[PDB]
Write an enzyme that holds these catalytic residues in place. Structure first.
Site, PDB file in Angstrom:
ATOM      1  N   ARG A 133      -2.216  41.750  30.186  1.00 20.01           N
ATOM      2  CA  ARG A 133      -3.406  41.989  31.004  1.00 20.01           C
ATOM      3  C   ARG A 133      -3.304  43.371  31.692  1.00 20.01           C
ATOM      4  NH1 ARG A 133      -0.507  37.601  33.205  1.00 20.01           N
ATOM      5  NH2 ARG A 133      -0.059  37.574  35.464  1.00 20.01           N
ATOM      6  N   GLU A 185      -9.676  41.035  35.628  1.00 17.15           N
ATOM      7  CA  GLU A 185      -9.664  39.571  35.571  1.00 17.15           C
ATOM      8  C   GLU A 185      -9.048  39.040  34.267  1.00 17.15           C
ATOM      9  OE1 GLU A 185     -13.201  36.828  36.865  1.00 17.15           O
ATOM     10  OE2 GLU A 185     -13.301  37.083  34.700  1.00 17.15           O
ATOM     11  N   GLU A 221       3.951  40.478  37.174  1.00 18.93           N
ATOM     12  CA  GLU A 221       3.469  39.572  38.200  1.00 18.93           C
ATOM     13  C   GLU A 221       4.598  38.689  38.738  1.00 18.93           C
ATOM     14  OE1 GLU A 221       1.781  38.639  40.749  1.00 18.93           O
ATOM     15  OE2 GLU A 221      -0.165  38.564  39.711  1.00 18.93           O
ATOM     16  N   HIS A 274       0.264  44.527  38.510  1.00 21.66           N
ATOM     17  CA  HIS A 274      -0.210  43.252  39.048  1.00 21.66           C
ATOM     18  C   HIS A 274      -0.254  43.255  40.575  1.00 21.66           C
ATOM     19  CE1 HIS A 274       0.493  41.676  34.940  1.00 21.66           C
ATOM     20  NE2 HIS A 274       1.473  42.565  34.969  1.00 21.66           N
ATOM     21  N   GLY A 275      -1.069  42.375  41.154  1.00 19.99           N
ATOM     22  CA  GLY A 275      -1.194  42.298  42.600  1.00 19.99           C
ATOM     23  C   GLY A 275       0.129  42.300  43.343  1.00 19.99           C
ATOM     24  N   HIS A 314       6.708  35.553  39.453  1.00 21.22           N
ATOM     25  CA  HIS A 314       6.973  34.372  38.636  1.00 21.22           C
ATOM     26  C   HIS A 314       6.731  33.105  39.461  1.00 21.22           C
ATOM     27  CE1 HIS A 314       8.655  31.406  36.063  1.00 21.22           C
ATOM     28  NE2 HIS A 314       9.275  32.249  35.257  1.00 21.22           N
ATOM     29  N   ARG A 369       1.461  30.879  52.495  1.00 26.66           N
ATOM     30  CA  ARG A 369       1.591  31.756  53.654  1.00 26.66           C
ATOM     31  C   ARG A 369       3.013  32.279  53.844  1.00 26.66           C
ATOM     32  NH1 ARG A 369       2.433  26.530  56.885  1.00 26.66           N
ATOM     33  NH2 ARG A 369       4.156  27.215  58.249  1.00 26.66           N
ATOM     34  N   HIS A 428      -4.578  44.957  37.152  1.00 26.59           N
ATOM     35  CA  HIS A 428      -5.207  44.582  35.898  1.00 26.59           C
ATOM     36  C   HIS A 428      -6.544  43.908  36.204  1.00 26.59           C
ATOM     37  CE1 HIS A 428      -4.724  40.342  36.634  1.00 26.59           C
ATOM     38  NE2 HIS A 428      -3.463  40.615  37.162  1.00 26.59           N
ATOM     39  N   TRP A 487      -6.975  33.298  32.562  1.00 26.50           N
ATOM     40  CA  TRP A 487      -6.583  32.282  33.541  1.00 26.50           C
ATOM     41  C   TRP A 487      -6.967  32.600  34.975  1.00 26.50           C
ATOM     42  CZ3 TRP A 487      -1.123  29.733  32.547  1.00 26.50           C
ATOM     43  CH2 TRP A 487      -1.121  29.153  31.262  1.00 26.50           C
ATOM     44  N   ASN A 488      -7.517  33.785  35.223  1.00 28.12           N
ATOM     45  CA  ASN A 488      -8.042  34.069  36.550  1.00 28.12           C
ATOM     46  C   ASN A 488      -9.323  33.246  36.643  1.00 28.12           C
ATOM     47  OD1 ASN A 488      -6.897  37.526  36.788  1.00 28.12           O
ATOM     48  ND2 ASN A 488      -6.056  35.679  37.761  1.00 28.12           N
TER      49      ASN A 488
END
Ligand SMILES: Cc1ccc(S(=O)(=O)Nc2cc3c(c(O)c2O)C(=O)c2ccccc2C3=O)cc1
Ligand SMILES: [Cl-]
Lengths: 234, 233
Positions: A61, A12, A88, A185-186, A90, A116, A10, A15-16
């Site tokens: 989005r 930007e 996305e 989503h990413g 959670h 990480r 999606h 909230w990005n």
């Protein structure tokens, strides 16, 4: 190759820009994000891409990114399937917090560890969380079982509830010869890329998919990529 | 008491709604878009919720639905598209304005087409500017020879819309899913005719308003318990 698969993250979100953890919060595209989705669409149009079916999340989005793409390529008539499983990650208690608030409350060390780690989740979203009812009581998740509705997710959790949708609903369509578009989503897309390329945990956590850019896969009949992923644009 | 909502898209580009737009995939005009936005806002103000949405494969209806869903914050709902809810196919008349239609076919014949329930316009021939544009559009690639119309009477339109209603929409209504249908004047005429048991004459006289939510309250037999209701001011 036998098959062609297209993914897009999606554009930007509002909230990005605020630098806040959205996760399952349903933040809309920012105007720039809308322009990103539009340019991705124009890229797919200039290259003559055609699809038969589209998959997306239940988050606007991603959905608005799909709508913008379908508009750009004049394929608004395509069937569209929405699922929470392509949502996305959670982000639990971190939802709604920005960078500074997150560091102030949990410390730089804890933040780096979460950042990480592949299988360590953020803290859970508790009932007193300001977005608890906004997300956990949203009727779009009313059909989820008690186990399915997360209070938080590691990247592992995310991929774990994303791949069953891939295997059970998307893979058969591809093998049916349907040309698939996935707008999501990413992290949900990270699940699919990890499965496709057989990547390691470290490798997938290093992969950062850009917002609003089409990602093309050429697959053989077993859905193995015959070459590296390619980005579309200028 | 089941609740069903219909919405007819507004104005299309290039004045195409006054040019037998039919199966040509005209987009909404900015004004038609604004109508859909006001209808969406009407539904938002009234607190309406839906569980599933049905529309055609034509973008003026689809963008109408998109606008409503945006307005009421339900972009996440499942959406089902079908050619069976397409506008009436106006065959050779598609794209012509009133004067062109009368000039090409004569007033007598135009009047006959206009007042008849079961007489179709002439087929869209290969020399028509939209012939390949519509008949070869890949969204209809899976239709069989009989299914893909070259032209339709109102009877034909209603006949291919109602099996979708019966087989796909009715079960959803009976499961208690709150249904939204965003479609076209003549496909919606088909549904309203079935619902109210109207005659050919009455349904040819019925002109559904554009961009206004149309509410039905149905009983367990999907018979309306009161006249259709409009939302707005
Ligand atoms: C909302 C937000 C706060 C802080 C940041 S950052 O400047 O530290 N960059 C950043 C941060 C993170 C992450 C990230 O990719 C990043 O670029 C994460 O992936 C992540 C995963 C699980 C818990 C926490 C994080 C995380 O903090 C980014 C976005
Ligand atoms: Cl849709």
């Amino acid at each position: 190759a036998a098959y062609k698969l297209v993914l897009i993250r999606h554009g930007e979100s509002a909230w990005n820009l605020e630098n806040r953890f959205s996760g399952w919060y349903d933040a809309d595209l920012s105007p720039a994000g809308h322009e990103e989705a539009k340019r991705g669409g124009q890229a797919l149009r200039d290259a003559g891409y055609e699809f038969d079916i589209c998959f997306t999340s239940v988050q606007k989005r991603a959905i608005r990114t799909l709508w913008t793409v379908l508009d750009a390529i004049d394929q608004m008539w395509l069937p569209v399937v929405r699922t929470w499983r392509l949502n996305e990650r959670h982000y639990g208690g971190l939802t709604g917090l920005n960078k500074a608030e997150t560091a102030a409350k949990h410390g730089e060390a804890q933040v780096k560890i979460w950042r990480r780690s592949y299988d360590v989740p953020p803290p859970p979203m508790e009932p007193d969380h300001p977005f608890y009812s906004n997300i956990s009581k949203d009727r779009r998740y009313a059909d989820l079982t008690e186990d399915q509705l997360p209070s938080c997710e590691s990247l592992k959790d995310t991929i774990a509830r994303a791949l069953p949708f891939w295997n059970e609903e998307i893979v058969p369509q591809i093998k049916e010869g349907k040309r698939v578009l996935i707008a999501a989503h990413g992290n949900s897309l990270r699940g699919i890329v990890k499965h496709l390329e057989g990547l390691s945990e470290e490798a997938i956590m290093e992969l950062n998919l850009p917002t609003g850019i089409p990602i093309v896969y050429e697959l053989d009949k077993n859905l193995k990529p015959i070459k590296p992923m390619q980005f579309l644009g200028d």
